[PDB]
From a paper:
Here, we present the discovery of a promiscuous allosteric site in SMYD2, a unique member of the protein lysine methyltransferase family characterized by the co-presence of the SET and MYND domains. SMYD2 is a critical regulator of numerous cellular processes, methylating both histone and non-histone proteins to control chromatin remodeling, DNA damage response, cell cycle progression, cell differentiation, cell survival, and inflammation. We have determined four crystal structures of SMYD2, including a wild-type protein structure in complex with a PARP1 peptide, a wild-type protein structure in complex with an ethylene glycol polymer (PEG), and two structures of SMYD2 mutants. In all structures, SMYD2 maintains a bilobal fold, with the N- and C-lobes displaying a similar orientation and a similar degree of opening.
L351A/W356A is a secondary-binding-site mutation that targets both subsites M and L, while F184A targets the target lysine access channel at the active site. In the L351A/W356A mutant structure, neither the secondary binding site nor the substrate binding site contains a peptide, although the PARP1 peptide was included during crystallization. This result suggests two possibilities: one is that this mutation disrupts binding at both sites, and the other is that the binding of the peptide to the substrate binding site depends on another peptide binding to the secondary binding site. Comparing the wild-type and mutant structures reveals that the mutation disrupts the integrity of the secondary binding site, making it less defined, explaining the loss of binding there. The most notable one is a slight movement of helices L, M, N, and O relative to helix P. This movement is likely allowed due to the extra space created by the mutation. Consistently, the substrate binding site, located about 8 Å from the mutation site, remains largely unaffected by the mutation. Strikingly, the L351A/W356A mutation completely abolished peptide binding, as evidenced by the absence of ITC heat changes. This indicates that this mutation disrupts both binding sites, consistent with the L351A/W356A mutant structure, where neither site binds to a peptide or PEG. Strikingly, the L351A/W356A mutation shifts the kinetic profile from sigmoidal to classic Michaelis-Menten kinetics, exhibiting single-site hyperbolic kinetic behavior. The L351A/W356A mutation results in a more than 10-fold increase in Vmax, while KM, which reflects apparent substrate binding affinity, shows a 4-fold increase.
Residue numbers in the entry:
A (entry chain A): 4 to 433
B (entry chain B): 5 to 433
The structure:
């Protein structure tokens, strides 16, 4: 059928999209869409159920592989048609079993089509076969990364899968890299990847009118602005903190397009985001271009460093970069804030909560002013800063920060969402 | 309808343009703004994308950095067309290389979607009415148009509403027949455009008007005496080559055979295929062999420029000129063509002394094979002129430049900007 209040249409310049037929207010559920295929990330095993993504302590372990946990035998046998793709190879390959998460998700996509080749209730407006691939635009270096995924697919998932032509496998991974979703928790921590066909129909905008939240394996779409009949439903694919140039670089790299919304054409927030300190002698333009290029490099340098460097060395990257940037950038600069945010996360892992709160409170005020009204990046930041206070018995500034997240999350997740209950339950704990 | 001219059906040539009032040599028949246009890739940074203004120091486009404008005025004025390529040029990167015909065709579809009514550029012949010569398309020729439709969907599928593939075949066929290539004062390629009213004029190897450009505006000026009732004729091809070579391009590219005075009588075919009668007169078959050889090496040099070094291109000319000099006189148009190519290669190596030695040899016989007012002769005088100005040979330099002014003042007009800059080159001491 068709989702009530919404209609599929061809947006001029954006291919296909989702358009509203009835008015939607801030907080209204536009539609819900169950996952077509989904996988729990490796680092969250034991904390969430494999079948329904229920976070709970004490989960029944899988007898054969011991690396898959369920709430009970109910969720176990329900997940077996998909778990059988990995249960046996995880023990046979042992340490050598390490497929990418995109390959894990793709292997279950092929499995779902094999045991359910007709339209699922997850694709009432956009079938999985209709996913745009951008195959024409794949760079040669990008083509080897997709071929390396097909090689791992045959390497790990050859037991239960009937593989189509290699041409059909290249286009399948291309669609997954464009239409794939990453499930996140309340703290915006990575929980897994999934495919939501009807949700993938919505286009991108740096000033979106809806935000996507998750209730286990079910994706919920809720309006973050006022949506009138005839207006297209827009979401955000990327982190809206960085300037127009940085945003469109991720968009062109990962999705093969350049955003042309109000923010991207006028560069309104580019002044406040690339904020410069107006000392007596204003920094020359070349001194600004050098620091911005320096800031983007060290941000990518920190991403590689986390994979193999000690926490004390990751904190040294932040404190060194902050010194070099503080000569030109004000503390409200998004690059200064990013490094300070990474330093806050490293302190939270070393359980130096006092040091993380000094970073969290410093950045929270300038952080929120660069985001939309109801943003999950701001809500999760208030949650992280909130729960750190509750562990140090600072329940004054703790519940004050938690109510800020609840205010934003009640619009994004909804008032009945389970995340809203647990945060209220954390303020009740005396 | 344009005053002084009328659209009519020429017997044997479909439709054409006919004059109603007398026109003197140099009179502007009409002017026509471009319907769709595109700047060639190799002239970016030298000319504005919107108005083809040649100027140093052009504002670069922030998003793609591969599109230059005079100012933000011309930038946003070209945005309804530039947005078709701005984003894909960065996304595709190195792999973005559509043919210029596809670039121009993609902008035609953009113009018709935001302006489906009659434009002031089609006061006598609409774009929909362009002849297609679809019946005459060879099956192998159909593969080049299908290869262009494939690239059209491949590169311009984001902002374009594509009709049926049948409607796309007929569209590219119209572009290949009615398309124009904008040239500068040296007849160097600046881009492609569509001038509907200008495309109405038929071809003749002795034309009465010549088409010049003032930025993106095409200007038509008479090169002969035009009486009321006479059809307005232009030239589609380079009038240097013999009748057989000329009509081969016409049947290949425009699917017709010219039947003007030159083609029916072959008057200049004797002087163009001039043969030197040494003591033992060259055999008749030896002429057919050298002519076929000369036409082959001309196409052989055409492929070589795309991937061979300039020092190797000069070896192709000097080798062919030696073999041809046994039968052909130095005034032969085939000898002149290779010498013209050698002159251009020497000018790229900045060996202007070596290029001037070729230029002076060919300039006098070159002009005698062309009409009185021909841009091919004007541009040749311009290249020879400014080459002297770089070597401080301003005597023979301004003397060669005054020859271009004589021809260009009739073709381009006395108010044309090209006439001002060359006068500024003689005034610069
Ligand atoms: N704001 C935007 N402007 C132009 N293209 C956009 C866009 N937002 C999304 N897209 C396009 O949509 C793709 C994301 S998947 C979203 C659905 C897609 N339009 C479809 O119907 O298949 C991207 O590859 C991008 O090319
Ligand atoms: N001298 C000539 N003799 C015969 N046909 C000619 C011609 N010059 C042009 N043509 C014809 O006209 C086409 C050129 S495009 C210009 C206009 C065409 N008469 C029209 O109907 O709109 C050629 O491709 C050929 O079909
Ligand atoms: Zn469960
Ligand atoms: Zn198992
Ligand atoms: Zn944007
Ligand atoms: Zn301009
Ligand atoms: Zn651009
Ligand atoms: Zn002729």
């Amino acid at each position: 059928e068709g989702l009530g209040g919404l209609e599929r249409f061809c947006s001029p310049g954006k291919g296909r999209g989702l358009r509203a037929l009835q008015p939607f207010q801030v907080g209204d559920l536009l539609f819900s869409c169950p996952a077509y295929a989904y996988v729990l990330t490796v680092n969250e095993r034991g904390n969430h159920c494999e079948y329904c993504f229920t976070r709970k302590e004490g989960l029944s372990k899988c007898g054969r592989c011991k690396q898959a946990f369920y709430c009970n035998v109910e969720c176990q046998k329900e997940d077996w048609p998909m778990h059988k793709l990995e249960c046996s190879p995880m023990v046979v390959f042992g340490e050598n079993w390490n497929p990418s998460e995109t390959v894990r998700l793709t292997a279950r996509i092929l499995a779902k089509q094999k045991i359910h080749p007709e339209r699922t209730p997850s694709e009432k407006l956009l079938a999985v076969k209709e996913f745009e691939s951008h195959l024409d635009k794949l760079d040669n270096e990008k083509k080897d990364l997709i071929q390396s995924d097909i090689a791992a697919l045959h390497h790990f998932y050859s037991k239960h899968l009937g593989f189509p032509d290699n041409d059909s496998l290249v286009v399948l991974f291309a669609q997954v890299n464009c239409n794939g979703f990453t499930i996140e928790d309340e703290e915006l921590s990575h929980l897994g990847s999934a495919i939501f066909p009807d949700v993938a129909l919505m286009n991108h905008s740096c000033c979106p009118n809806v935000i996507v939240t998750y209730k286990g394996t079910l994706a919920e779409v809720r309006a973050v602005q006022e949506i009138k009949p005839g207006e297209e439903v827009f979401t955000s694919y990327i982190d809206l903190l960085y300037p127009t140039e940085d945003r469109n670089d991720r968009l062109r790299d990962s999705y093969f397009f350049t955003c042309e919304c109000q923010e991207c054409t006028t560069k309104d927030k580019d002044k406040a985001k690339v904020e410069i300190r107006k000392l007596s002698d204003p920094p020359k333009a070349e001194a600004i271009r050098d620091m911005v290029r320096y800031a983007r490099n060290v941000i990518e340098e920190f991403r590689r460093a986390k994979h193999y460097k000690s926490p004390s060395e990751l904190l040294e990257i932040c404190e060194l970069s902050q010194e070099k940037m503080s000569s030109v950038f004000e503390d409200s600069n998004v690059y200064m804030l990013h490094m300070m945010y990474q330093a806050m996360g490293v302190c939270a892992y070393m359980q130096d909560a006092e040091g993380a709160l000094q970073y969290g409170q410093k950045i929270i005020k300038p952080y929120s002013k660069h985001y939309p009204l109801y943003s999950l990046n701001v809500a999760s930041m208030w949650l992280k800063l909130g729960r750190l206070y509750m562990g140090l018995e600072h329940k004054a500034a703790g519940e004050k920060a938690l109510k800020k997240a609840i205010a934003i999350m009640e619009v994004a997740h909804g008032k009945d969402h389970p995340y809203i209950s647990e945060i209220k339950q954390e303020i009740e704990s005396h």
